[PDB]
Design a protein around this ligand. Structure first.
Ligand SMILES: CCCCCC/C=C/CCCCCCCCCC(=O)O[C@H](COC(=O)CCCCCCCCCCCCCCC)COP(=O)(O)OC[C@@H](O)CO
Ligand SMILES: Nc1ncnc2c1ncn2[C@@H]1O[C@H](COP(=O)(O)OP(=O)(O)O)[C@@H](O)[C@H]1O
Ligand SMILES: Nc1ncnc2c1ncn2[C@@H]1O[C@H](COP(=O)(O)OP(=O)(O)O)[C@@H](O)[C@H]1O
Ligand SMILES: OC[C@H]1O[C@H](O[C@H]2[C@H](O)[C@@H](O)[C@@H](O)O[C@@H]2CO)[C@H](O)[C@@H](O)[C@@H]1O
Ligand code: ALF
Ligand code: ALF
Ligand SMILES: [Mg+2]
Ligand SMILES: [Mg+2]
Lengths: 374, 490, 288, 371, 358
């Protein structure tokens, strides 16, 4: 039983929880309702177990993709912002927080991979992937390299793979077709073939992981990398004169990085649904509210139209939003589990030389489709 | 001397707390906890009552702890295996029904409301956005369910608009008001700012059937699969589902499904081999080190001793990931050294056998201090004169070790080694963090890898594999691998 | 011939260096500016900031503003010591008394119980946290001192993991000649007196082993303590340092400093336990 | 207290180390157990003390059946053959342990610890642990532990085996003095025939499970009930010669010596169940053989061994038609070479005679010292 | 191999447990160590074994220095006072342990084990573990382990102490049989005087860590160097009486008893020594000595009688053959033989006896 007449909120330890607590302190000044913010470890695994018994926090903040699971389990209240409130946020973010065609959380922030580059080594960053091979060759003469990113995790390599028609599950009209998997198609093959050939021509290395990539950019050894907003503070400490821009295009088509939308759901078992609604709609999701959290720890790009526009004056944040908008939303369905392992494996297989691109993705398609059906 | 009557006094005082807590547990609704605590305490009191059960006094406290935190969790896991407890079916029936009955739909209009004081009483205003019409009630008092006739008005209320604070303080009483428009419509508080025609999505009939107030469709509990299903059954299934008994369905699925059975034998062999080599190498390395570091001639042993156990003093999690860095095929300082000397770069991740070597190297690094520390203490049980005797028989250091030290240690070490085998059999974490089970076993329709243990391949089916988190399946397989490792210890 | 010492010194030194290397890389991460899992053994850009925040110091940063310590790392360490120390004492006391009965006394179905203990504790702990949470949630409303969000509950939870320690102490008890307690009994010693005054002092090495092993287990324990403890100021260090781990990145420098810090209490306990790790305790007792 | 064993049997599976043993030790009685190595002497003490289980039969201490009584409640102390000293405690602590378990005053403890310590010559070793002691010192510590305890029943299992002869004499006297002061039951196992003869009110002779004979010291020496006892009490062992019965009176037996001269001799020994012509064994102790010069029966042969003991000389003689050598004890240092001719006298009154089953023809010569 | 010690000293920090000891043990010699409980017998043996270090002095085995040679390389074996059996090994395995180390020959091992086990009467116990044996049986396993290995030097520490009278006799013989057959050096520690007298080529008498005397069994019995050796060799102990005129070849002393009798002794405040076996019946000798009987001990073969002489605080012990019927409190007189009397000075040293003994 969740205690009536107060608000318990759960948010991760890398978000601006002290900022959020100030928004709660204002809410208390206006309502007399005390707001408590907690950042317990593995809150994404804890919530399902406590909310099942009708306990847990009144509000939970996490990436949207987990919320489709919670919703199916019957742990989230169906929220009701009117048409006027929905106009205040970017419509594509509302697509991320739907279960069975119903809204189940309030979008807060937007997260996606961007092209980070060294201004001193590369003043004008390339707009296309095809441009890299030639650019690596003139940098190799100076002892540097063009591009180093995490080639081990499909999250980092997917933007290029997806660019020409690769996709996880077909998103028809508010419904994910679990039977329609697109890791086998011509676009995916072309994307992965290009990546493999970058390794084949020694522009990149098949066993470059997150740590090796990041260290090489921060030390000024590589001209560019592909990483998210979590990486910026490290580069600030390194004092690398750096920019964040739109990801390079493949075959005239934008990279499609996966989009993670930080979202706030209301616990279905909360006796404080109306209080939570008020807090989230009229207190947090305002310029002043989001600014309080942002000042504590930066939110990156936010879903609120008005505040994003003030944030986007920082080109790094504008680039994030741009790559996010041209990218694909992370499916909030359970069948995504199969996707991750199968695609991760296929890229390793193609990069190391164990399998060719064709068969590696053909097998990965088979493995996702049989796991999604039976 | 302490009193003899004091024993019966303490046993009486403890015999009071039990019963005071037991009958108190019997109330509200804690039956399983009342029965379990009764048999446990009564056994404890009986054991200390008669002096004929003396030996049990030594065993009871320890067995009580074990039953509570080892056996009880064990039984639940087994229990769960006979149900469909999963992400999809996580709630009890009651909870699932409760969730569904809390569901609502907007049946009518929506009005922004204000609260206005009239002396010591209140006045409720509604604003119709779509017509620009405004409605206002007569003076009323808060408290309980009440219906208010609203009247269309052009005038402003006399009182000053109430704060959010005042609305919030009076929210319960406010939520019990049914507002009535001049045209007959009923409207209730749906938020702190709005009154609307929000209504329950379903109604509970009494015989079990739920019916949707929006579509007229009827649903009934299908306890075979654990869902409210339309009604003789229809094609539609309502979520959330509820946990329900499935008997052998989770156990048989490991025997039914070909494809999850294809690499079973091959994975099993590697898991057995991985464990045996780990146990052997850790015991051997640990035993020798323990021997060398008690050797009184060794003038630095006190320092050596500490440094040798540090791999066990640091939490293994970071260490494993650092090893993952060190073992990188192109980067990582191991192969940078094997490039300069010897001139070879082993495929620690790409090649199945070298990956298995890497995994064993890391595990031995992780596990040798455990065995070292044990031997450090176990070695103290060997009397020194046995080595005076062996000296008179003409033994050297190596002969001492294999004819006296080793055999005297393997007997107490035997149960510890059998335990270390079972632990490493299920060493999920290591394989996940270091290799993710890779490299990939090709042709495995349900994904398997070369360094995958049995646990790694299995929990991938249960917690990944696109079905959500199936706890019942993982519980059933946990029972099966337990029965396998228990049969192995023979 | 004592070139054997030289060959042993040399081999141990080569072995130590090898086994230390991964740990020195952890130390390097804790001293490296920013948060980076890889780099040179001596970090090119050395930073004291990770150790400053861990030890309670505020950090002046690049833009001017001062960063106060986000977490009470030292309090977490103290909570670790407390939970590990009491816990270890409890596991020692429960398992020695148990072993004494298994080693010296006889009671029907003894062999089945011992082999039951070794088997049942080797069951895959996978759905255990579901069972455990339900247990301590229920326990808390009757004895709050040992419910959720308490050190008591955490300590209590570990007291069940004795099976192996029982066997270890049983085994050691059996190396000690029975006639010492036989003589004790004839002096009028009760089974308890013989246990405390004769057997235990001669068993002191294995008591140190079981204490060490339990202390290490407790300090490094995450899932159970993370499941039971809610309040930040009651976190153990193993629980607390999980704050540094996020879905896409780690605060490696903070995490490494925490890892290195947690090794400190284990080392001191290991050092202190040495005085009970002695040879020839039973010499002069039994002719044979 | 009294201690009695009725039909006490002990088995280690199918290996039986005590067969149907019956003993009756009265209060204040000093009973010495003797017997061959590994015959069951300690096993008896351990069953008495409660350290070993009894297979069948009943043990009584102070007239209470004790089979299932814990050792602590037996009123028994033991000087373990293996000493079983507490290796983590000093000599003083070892001797004072039993007293500390009672609520004994420290000055009371210190008084009777130092008392027993000074008679056992351990006074300078109180602070030493058993490891920092000689085996003979450790043995005295074991004696002192049981001596301080002053139990109802003392069990001493070869308590002097590792002490010098002179000290062995001093320890013998102190134990004897204690038994006189306290008048308590003492069961004492020894391999030293002098200890047995000097200390015992009664000697029990054991032979691989069975009780061979119970009796007074002089009673067993002069009148063994059989061939085994005769060869076990007194050392050097009794000589045995095969003889043939030639004639019988109710009060005496005439036998033919095995030598080529076939000499006949009457022995003052019972003729009960002794047929003319039967083969017997003639017993004669080394100390009882006579110098040849004045003797009716003479055995002569070649000297095989000379053992010069200082106080006496022992001479082993090979005599024709007898397989085993004859051992003889002369007083003082006698100069005799190996290979020389030697003759000894064989006195009829001191000859023992044993039937084919080894049972003794009861001697009828009244030997002084036995009632 | 031969064995010799040269100014060998041993100290536990500062406590001297062996002071400047000198021994020359020739190849094929049987030497026995005797001395009071805790005098340093086993310490000396262990120093020879290499189980104890040597502070100062020189130790040689087979004409080569051994001080710094480890125990295992000394060509030595030992029967431990405490047995020190291998608990995890059978009797057979305990006995064949050294042979299994130095070159395992399955048959040669089995045969020599079965032979040595037969003479120690252990053949029925070959499969036993030490826990399932008697003290005495374990002692014989200890012996069997050393005898089987056939070292160059046999060290035996009180190896018969827990064996019955009759078995002890048989073991002495087998130890002698092996000593003459191998002709190798044996150092033997015993508290049994009959063992010392019959086995030894040479007896070493130790006192508080130092050598009191070294010589032939009969040499030490008839001609001890000092009071301590006189009192230690031969049991029952030699009697001592605290005894005017001296001749060129002999000494005259006066008895403390009230009559104050003067007697000449063929020797070089003093103490007169006379053995219980050397005292004569009353009517025979010229020097009569009368007192009161205190203790009578009936041994079967002989009667030992304790006599409290007036003005003599210490009792006088007399041995006589056969069973003598004498009771406590009765008067008893013995003859004191002048030629058999020992004499000791103020310091403790003996005046050399001139009466030639057989
Ligand atoms: C796969 C194994 C990997 C091991 C890697 C370990 C890394 C450490 C590198 C060190 C290498 C060893 C160097 C050996 C040098 C000899 C040391 C020495 O000479 O010192 C010896 C130390 O003993 C001793 O363990 C002597 C040492 C024992 C020798 C036996 C070595 C073989 C071990 C392999 C067999 C596995 C064991 C089976 C376990 C299932 C002295 O012994 P002693 O005084 O005679 O004994 C009496 C007392 O000490 C006993 O209480
Ligand atoms: N645990 C045992 N198992 C089997 N036999 C044993 C055990 N302990 C002792 N024995 C045997 O019992 C017999 C008697 O032992 P013990 O009483 O010690 O003899 P002793 O007369 O030398 O004191 C011996 O033959 C010995 O081998
Ligand atoms: N660790 C020690 N510290 C001091 N004295 C010791 C130590 N070990 C033995 N001793 C002493 O050394 C003396 C000689 O010992 P040992 O050679 O065993 O005597 P024994 O002649 O009876 O064999 C004994 O008096 C003993 O108390
Ligand atoms: O066997 C390798 C293994 O060793 C250690 O695991 C120990 C553990 O520390 C003990 O508490 C107990 O559970 O036994 C285990 C060995 O059986 C390491 O902690 C572990 O990481 C490693 O895999
Ligand atoms: F131990 Al000793 F004489 F006292 F050998
Ligand atoms: F052989 Al024994 F007492 F052990 F006679
Ligand atoms: Mg015995
Ligand atoms: Mg000794």
């Amino acid at each position: 039983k969740i205690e009536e007449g107060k608000l318990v909120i759960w948010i991760n330890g890398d978000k601006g929880y002290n900022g959020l607590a100030e928004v709660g302190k204002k809410f208390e000044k206006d309502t007399g309702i005390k707001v408590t913010v907690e950042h317990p470890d593995k809150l994404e695994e804890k919530f399902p177990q406590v909310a099942a018994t009708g306990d847990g926090p009144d509000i939970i903040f996490w990436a949207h993709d987990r919320f489709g699971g919670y919703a199916q389990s019957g742990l989230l209240a169906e929220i009701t912002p009117d048409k006027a409130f929905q106009d205040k946020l970017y419509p594509f973010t509302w697509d991320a927080v739907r279960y069975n065609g119903k809204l189940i959380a309030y979008p807060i922030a937007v997260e996606a991979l961007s092209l980070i580059y060294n201004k001193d080594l590369l003043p004008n960053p390339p707009k296309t992937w095809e441009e890299i091979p030639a650019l690596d060759k003139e940098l190799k003469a100076k002892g540097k390299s063009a591009l180093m990113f995490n080639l081990q995790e499909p999250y980092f390599t997917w933007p290029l793979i997806a660019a020409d028609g690769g996709y996880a599950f077909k998103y028809e009209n508010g419904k994910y077709d679990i039977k329609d998997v697109g890791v086998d198609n011509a676009g995916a093959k072309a994307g992965l073939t290009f990546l493999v050939d970058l390794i084949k021509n020694k522009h990149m290395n098949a066993d470059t992981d997150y740590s090796i990539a990041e260290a090489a950019f921060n030390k000024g050894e590589t001209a560019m990398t592909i990483n998210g907003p979590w990486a910026w503070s490290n580069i600030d400490t390194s004092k690398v004169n750096y920019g964040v821009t739109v990801l390079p295009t493949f075959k005239g088509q934008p990279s499609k990085p996966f989009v993670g939308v930080l979202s706030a759901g209301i616990n279905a078992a909360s006796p404080n649904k109306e209080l939570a609604k008020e807090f989230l709609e009229n207190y947090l999701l305002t310029d002043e509210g989001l600014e309080a959290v942002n000042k504590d720890k930066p939110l990156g790009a936010v879903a609120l139209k008005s505040y994003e526009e003030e944030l986007a004056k920082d080109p790094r944040i504008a680039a994030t939003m741009e790559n996010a908008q041209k990218g694909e939303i992370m499916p909030n369905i359970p069948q995504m589990s199969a996707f991750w392992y199968a695609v991760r494996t296929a890229v390793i297989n193609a990069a190391s030389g164990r399998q060719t691109v064709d068969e590696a993705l053909k097998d990965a398609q088979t493995r996702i489709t049989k796991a999604s059906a039976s | 001397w302490q009193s003899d009557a004091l024993k019966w006094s303490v046993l009486g005082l403890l015999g009071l707390l039990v019963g005071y807590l037991v009958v108190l547990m019997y109330a509200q609704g804690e039956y399983l906890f009342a029965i379990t605590t009764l048999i446990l305490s009564s056994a404890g009191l009986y054991i200390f009552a008669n002096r004929k059960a003396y030996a049990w006094r030594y065993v009871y406290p320890g067995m009580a702890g074990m039953g509570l935190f080892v056996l009880f969790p064990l039984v639940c896991t087994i229990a769960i295996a006979f149900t469909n407890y999963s992400s999809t079916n996580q709630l009890t029936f009651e909870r699932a029904q409760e969730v569904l009955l809390d569901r609502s739909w907007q049946a009518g209009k929506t009005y922004n409301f204000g609260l206005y004081p009239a002396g010591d009483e209140w006045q409720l205003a509604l604003s119709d956005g779509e017509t620009g019409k405004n409605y206002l009630s007569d003076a009323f008092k808060f408290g309980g369910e009440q219906k208010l006739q609203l009247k269309e008005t052009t005038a402003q209320p006399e009182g000053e608009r109430a704060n959010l604070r005042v609305i919030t303080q009076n929210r319960q009483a406010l939520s019990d008001i049914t507002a009535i428009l001049p045209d007959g419509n009923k409207v209730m508080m749906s938020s702190l700012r709005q009154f609307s025609g929000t209504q329950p999505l379903y109604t509970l009939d009494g015989d079990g059937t739920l019916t949707n107030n929006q579509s007229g469709v009827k649903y009934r509990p299908n306890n075979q699969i654990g869902f409210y299903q339309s009604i003789n059954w229809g094609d539609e299934k309502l979520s959330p589902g509820y946990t329900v008994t499935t008997g052998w369905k989770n156990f048989t699925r490991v025997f039914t499904d070909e494809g999850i059975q294809k690499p079973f034998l091959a994975i099993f062999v590697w898991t057995v081999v991985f464990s045996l080599i780990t146990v052997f190498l850790t015991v051997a390395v640990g035993m020798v080190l323990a021997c060398l570091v008690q050797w009184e001639a060794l003038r630095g042993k006190a320092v050596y001793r500490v440094l040798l156990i540090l791999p066990y003093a640091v939490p293994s999690f970071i260490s494993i990931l650092i090893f993952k860095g060190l073992f990188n095929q192109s980067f990582g300082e191991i192969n940078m050294m094997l490039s300069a000397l010897f001139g070879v770069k082993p495929a620690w991740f790409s090649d199945p056998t070298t990956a298995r070597t890497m995994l064993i190297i890391v595990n031995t690094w992780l596990g040798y201090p455990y065995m070292m520390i044990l031997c450090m203490g176990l070695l103290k049980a060997i009397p020194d004169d046995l080595y005076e005797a062996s000296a008179m028989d003409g033994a050297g250091p190596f002969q001492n070790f294999f004819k006296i030290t080793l055999p005297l240690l393997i007997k107490p070490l035997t149960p510890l080694m059998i335990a270390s085998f079972a632990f490493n059999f299920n060493n999920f974490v290591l394989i996940q963090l270091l290799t993710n089970g890779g490299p990939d076993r090709l042709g495995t329709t349900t994904p398997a890898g070369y360094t995958d243990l049995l646990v790694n391949y299995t929990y991938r089916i249960a917690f990944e594999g696109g079905g959500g988190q199936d706890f019942g399946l993982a519980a059933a397989i946990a029972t099966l691998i337990f029965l396998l490792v228990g049969a192995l210890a023979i | 011939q004592k070139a054997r010492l030289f060959i042993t010194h040399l081999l141990l030194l080569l072995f130590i260096a090898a086994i230390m290397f991964p740990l020195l890389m952890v130390v390097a991460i804790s001293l490296r500016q920013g948060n980076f899992a890889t780099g040179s053994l001596i970090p090119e850009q050395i930073s004291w900031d990770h150790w400053k925040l861990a030890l309670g110091f505020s950090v002046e940063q690049a833009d001017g503003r001062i960063t106060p310590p986000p977490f009470p790392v030292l309090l977490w360490l103290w909570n670790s010591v407390k939970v590990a120390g009491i816990s270890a004492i409890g596991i020692v006391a429960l398992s020695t008394t148990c072993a004494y009965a298994f080693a010296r006394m006889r009671f029907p179905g003894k062999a089945t119980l011992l082999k039951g203990m070794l088997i049942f504790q080797m069951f895959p702990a996978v759905l255990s946290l579901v069972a455990l949470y339900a247990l301590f949630d229920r326990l808390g409303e009757y004895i709050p001192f040992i419910g959720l969000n308490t050190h008591g509950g955490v300590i209590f939870a570990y007291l069940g993991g004795i099976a192996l320690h029982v066997w270890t102490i049983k085994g050691y008890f059996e190396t000690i000649d029975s006639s010492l307690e036989e003589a004790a009994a004839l002096d009028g010693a009760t089974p308890w007196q013989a246990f405390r005054l004769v057997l235990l002092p001669l068993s002191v090495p294995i008591l140190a082993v079981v204490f060490i092993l339990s202390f290490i287990a407790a300090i490094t324990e995450v899932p159970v303590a993370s499941l039971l403890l809610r309040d930040v100021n009651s976190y153990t260090l193993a629980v607390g340092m999980q704050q540094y781990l996020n879905p896409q990145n780690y605060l490696w420098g903070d995490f490494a400093a925490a890892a290195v810090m947690s090794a400190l209490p284990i080392t001191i306990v290991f050092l202190l336990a040495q005085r009970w790790l002695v040879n020839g305790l039973t010499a002069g007792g039994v002719k044979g | 207290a009294s201690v009695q064993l009725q039909n006490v049997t002990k088995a280690w599976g199918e290996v039986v180390v005590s067969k149907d043993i019956n003993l009756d030790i009265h209060e204040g009685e000093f009973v010495v157990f003797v017997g061959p190595s590994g015959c069951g002497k300690s096993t008896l003490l351990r069953m008495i003390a409660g350290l070993e289980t009894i297979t069948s039969g009943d043990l009584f201490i102070g007239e209470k059946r004790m089979n299932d009584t814990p050792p602590a409640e037996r009123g028994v102390g033991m000087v373990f053959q293996s000493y079983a000293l507490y290796p983590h405690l000093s000599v003083a602590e070892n001797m004072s342990f039993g007293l500390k378990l009672a609520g004994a005053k420290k000055e009371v403890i210190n008084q009777r610890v130092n008392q027993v310590a000074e008679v056992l010559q351990l006074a300078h070793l109180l602070d030493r642990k058993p490891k920092a002691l000689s085996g003979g010192q450790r043995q005295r510590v074991a004696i002192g532990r049981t001596l301080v305890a002053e139990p109802s029943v003392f069990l001493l299992d070869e308590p002097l085996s590792n002490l010098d002869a002179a000290l062995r004499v001093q320890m013998r006297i102190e134990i004897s003095r204690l038994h006189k002061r306290l008048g308590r039951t003492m069961i004492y196992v020894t391999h030293d025939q002098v200890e047995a003869m000097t200390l015992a009110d009664k000697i029990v002779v054991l032979d691989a499970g069975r009780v061979a004979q119970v009796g007074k010291p002089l009673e067993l020496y002069h009148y063994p009930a059989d061939r085994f006892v005769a060869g076990f009490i007194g050392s050097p062992k009794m000589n045995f010669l095969p003889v043939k019965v030639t004639a019988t009176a109710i009060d005496q037996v005439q036998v033919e010596l095995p030598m080529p001269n076939r000499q006949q001799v009457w022995l003052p020994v019972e003729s009960r169940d002794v047929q003319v012509g039967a083969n017997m064994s003639l017993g004669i102790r080394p100390e009882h053989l006579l110098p040849s010069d004045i003797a009716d029966v003479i055995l002569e042969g070649e000297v095989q061994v000379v053992e010069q003991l200082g106080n006496e000389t022992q001479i082993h003689i090979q005599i024709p038609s007898i397989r085993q050598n004859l051992v003889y004890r002369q007083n003082d240092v006698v100069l005799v070479e190996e290979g020389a001719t030697f003759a000894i006298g064989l006195p009829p009154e001191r000859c023992h005679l044993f039937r084919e089953d080894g049972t003794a023809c009861r001697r009828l010569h009244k030997e002084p010292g036995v009632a």
